[PDB]
Amino acid sequence: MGPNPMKMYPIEGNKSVQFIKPILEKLENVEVGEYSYYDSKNGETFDKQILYHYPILNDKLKIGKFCSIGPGVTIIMNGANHRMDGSTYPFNLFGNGWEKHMPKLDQLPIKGDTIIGNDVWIGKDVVIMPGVKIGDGAIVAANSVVVKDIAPYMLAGGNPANEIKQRFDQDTINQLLDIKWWNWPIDIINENIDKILDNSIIREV
Amino acid sequence: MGPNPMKMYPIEGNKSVQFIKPILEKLENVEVGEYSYYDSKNGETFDKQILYHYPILNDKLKIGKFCSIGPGVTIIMNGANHRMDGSTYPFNLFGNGWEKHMPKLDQLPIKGDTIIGNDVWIGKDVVIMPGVKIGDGAIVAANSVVVKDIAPYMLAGGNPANEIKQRFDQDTINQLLDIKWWNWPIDIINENIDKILDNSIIREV
Amino acid sequence: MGPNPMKMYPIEGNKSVQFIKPILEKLENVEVGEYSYYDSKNGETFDKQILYHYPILNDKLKIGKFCSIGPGVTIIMNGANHRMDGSTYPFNLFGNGWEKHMPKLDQLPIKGDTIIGNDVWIGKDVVIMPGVKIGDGAIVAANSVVVKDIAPYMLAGGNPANEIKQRFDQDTINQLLDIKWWNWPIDIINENIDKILDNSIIREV
Ligand SMILES: CC(=O)SCCNC(=O)CCNC(=O)[C@H](O)C(C)(C)COP(=O)(O)OP(=O)(O)OC[C@H]1O[C@@H](n2cnc3c(N)ncnc32)[C@H](O)[C@@H]1OP(=O)(O)O
Ligand SMILES: CC(=O)SCCNC(=O)CCNC(=O)[C@H](O)C(C)(C)COP(=O)(O)OP(=O)(O)OC[C@H]1O[C@@H](n2cnc3c(N)ncnc32)[C@H](O)[C@@H]1OP(=O)(O)O
Ligand SMILES: CC(=O)SCCNC(=O)CCNC(=O)[C@H](O)C(C)(C)COP(=O)(O)OP(=O)(O)OC[C@H]1O[C@@H](n2cnc3c(N)ncnc32)[C@H](O)[C@@H]1OP(=O)(O)O
Numbered sequence: 001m002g003p004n005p006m007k008m009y010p011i012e013g014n015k016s017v018q019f020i021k022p023i024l025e026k027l028e029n030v031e032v033g034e035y036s037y038y039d040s041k042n043g044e045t046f047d048k049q050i051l052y053h054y055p056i057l058n059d060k061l062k063i064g065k066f067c068s069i070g071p072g073v074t075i076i077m078n079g080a081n082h083r084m085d086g087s088t089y090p091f092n093l094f095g096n097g098w099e100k101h102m103p104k105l106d107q108l109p110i111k112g113d114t115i116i117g118n119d120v121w122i123g124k125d126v127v128i129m130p131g132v133k134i135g136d137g138a139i140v141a142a143n144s145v146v147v148k149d150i151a152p153y154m155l156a157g158g159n160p161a162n163e164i165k166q167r168f169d170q171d172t173i174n175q176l177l178d179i180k181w182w183n184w185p186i187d188i189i190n191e192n193i194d195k196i197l198d199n200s201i202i203r204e205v
Numbered sequence: 206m207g208p209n210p211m212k213m214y215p216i217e218g219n220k221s222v223q224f225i226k227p228i229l230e231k232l233e234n235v236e237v238g239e240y241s242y243y244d245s246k247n248g249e250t251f252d253k254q255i256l257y258h259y260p261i262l263n264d265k266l267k268i269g270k271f272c273s274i275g276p277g278v279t280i281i282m283n284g285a286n287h288r289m290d291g292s293t294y295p296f297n298l299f300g301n302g303w304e305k306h307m308p309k310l311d312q313l314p315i316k317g318d319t320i321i322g323n324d325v326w327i328g329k330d331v332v333i334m335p336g337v338k339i340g341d342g343a344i345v346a347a348n349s350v351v352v353k354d355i356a357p358y359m360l361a362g363g364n365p366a367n368e369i370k371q372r373f374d375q376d377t378i379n380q381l382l383d384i385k386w387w388n389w390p391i392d393i394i395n396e397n398i399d400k401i402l403d404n405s406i407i408r409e410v
Numbered sequence: 411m412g413p414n415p416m417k418m419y420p421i422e423g424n425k426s427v428q429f430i431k432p433i434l435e436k437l438e439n440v441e442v443g444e445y446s447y448y449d450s451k452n453g454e455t456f457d458k459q460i461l462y463h464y465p466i467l468n469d470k471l472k473i474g475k476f477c478s479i480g481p482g483v484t485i486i487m488n489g490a491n492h493r494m495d496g497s498t499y500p501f502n503l504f505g506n507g508w509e510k511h512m513p514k515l516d517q518l519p520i521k522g523d524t525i526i527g528n529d530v531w532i533g534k535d536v537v538i539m540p541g542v543k544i545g546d547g548a549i550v551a552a553n554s555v556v557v558k559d560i561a562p563y564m565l566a567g568g569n570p571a572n573e574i575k576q577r578f579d580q581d582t583i584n585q586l587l588d589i590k591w592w593n594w595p596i597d598i599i600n601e602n603i604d605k606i607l608d609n610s611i612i613r614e615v
Binding site: 076084160 | 412414534567604608
Binding site: 206208216326329342346362364372401402404405406 | 486490492493494495496497498499500501503504505506507508510511513537539555557568569570
């Protein structure tokens, strides 16, 4: 029961809402969660929202299951960082003799992989910078610029985004993180969708 | 004197500057002032700058008059709020049996109506979140994101937007909030525009 | 050795990378450094990125040499401020008798000149407000909004953009702000690019 997570467009007669996993499974250094979707801004597929991702750099992008991603969201990978131990001007880029000054792989600054947990909600037009980690259950307010990691089930926003408030009490959150319902076989998930939606899934255990 | 506030396009040989009342009164749950205008960013009419406004949630939008609205300014109504008591994933939205979980009105969080006073100036590309009240005579810096209320004659800006400073001494402010020149027939505002542009209407009155 | 600074497009066959100077020289009240380039977002020339710049207001824009300006960057000049001693509403703009109230120049808030130092890197979609100074060797994080000055060799970011951390120890900077390699006769620079790229230039000079 439910949609088919392998369909590019699960909603029939709708080419705005798309399932990410299908779109990005041909990609290298990219992992996506089963039911995570993207609500297109101008009909663009989400692969076009991932900027500066070069396999050479080998930075990997991970997105968990059941993620609600708003339109315009932009994931900036490590491709666009400039060498900064000195002048940030890319001489090597203009040839005519400057090609020799090509940077060395271990000379480019790499901030790590971008990892997004499960059940995360990302508002529209959010910009996620490199090497950022967003824990499960997090909610990132629209038009935010995520520069540092976000703790699970935290409400974060602004530019630079900051943790505004905890979604639930420490306890509940610990429970939830431990429970990990997004990691259940669909049959079960399908049966408690309501409790998952009202957070009582905890109490039945 | 002055243009007829009922004219969509006040200035001739110009489909860029538009009086909003005319345009937006073709809408449910929207109240617009008389001389409030919108400076188009690419020709688009302002009604298109209002997102997720669904009559069913019954949230309304009100805009005083003599408001200067920069281009690209965006208003965000309650139509995009996800349920948050539990998981933020819109199961119901995918059908195929998940429809049953469609959230009940009393379950979606509605932050309230969004109210923007008179003589309010909003910079370009500003984003306004739901249920936010903005004060009479306030200036909102370009590129701000308004998540909380702003007091009258306050200068605010940032992401999130913060009150930066007051525009005039409390005294002067208390007065203008008293006089409310914007509520006067135009035949009158007409012969004081000068005492209004230089804040001297406070002494005539 | 190196590309010709008088070429709009220094990279044969490429219409995205463009040297700012040969493009903006035709404009009055604009000063640009020789090797400063702009990475076009959608193929547009940089001049489209400078807004509300009226010669009459006589404000000027200044960009040093060897600057790496990113795509989408937007520089806003002073033709965008409204009078603020009274109402922020532009009565004169609508004419039909209101032209009377055109504001005199000394009445318009003019914040001053915008000056971008040398060897400065500005990330994508950074918006620069009027009358700001950005020091040499500074670095501005993408999606920032510059509302105030920025000391040299400072890494800044946010909205409002804030200085985050000095790129190097004072020592280095002082010598750096002293050597002024961007001011050297090219051919000398051609022989020290490597030294400039890793900051070892200090040691020699
Ligand atoms: C695929 C899809 O996503 S579908 C639709 C597209 N979606 C969007 O754009 C979703 C965005 N929704 C939001 O951003 C919403 O602002 C609040 C994130 C979900 C979103 O929090 P709420 O539960 O309602 O909290 P609330 O309104 O009370 O805000 C709490 C505090 O945070 C502040 N706040 C709100 N937004 C921000 C922000 N971006 N940065 C910092 N603080 C913020 C408030 O000012 C308030 O201040 P206070 O605690 O000092 O009094
Ligand atoms: C339809 C139409 O509106 S027509 C044109 C389109 N218009 C626009 O984009 C309008 C935008 N104009 C602005 O945003 C302008 O920045 C200042 C809002 C109107 C706009 O204030 P000013 O009177 O000139 O104040 P000033 O320059 O001195 O700034 C005061 C302080 O606020 C800070 N500031 C400026 N912008 C911001 C901001 N967005 N957030 C926080 N602080 C800010 C300054 O850094 C300064 O700091 P300090 O007090 O610690 O020293
Ligand atoms: C022409 C061209 O430009 S080519 C490509 C187009 N380019 C772009 O978009 C370039 C943008 N690159 C960046 O913005 C990059 O974020 C960091 C500016 C260059 C860019 O700094 P780094 O050396 O790597 O520093 P680092 O990652 O450690 O960040 C340091 C601190 O600043 C914070 N930070 C990062 N971005 C921001 C920001 N915008 N505002 C405030 N703080 C920020 C971090 O959270 C961190 O916090 P902490 O000190 O408390 O722990």
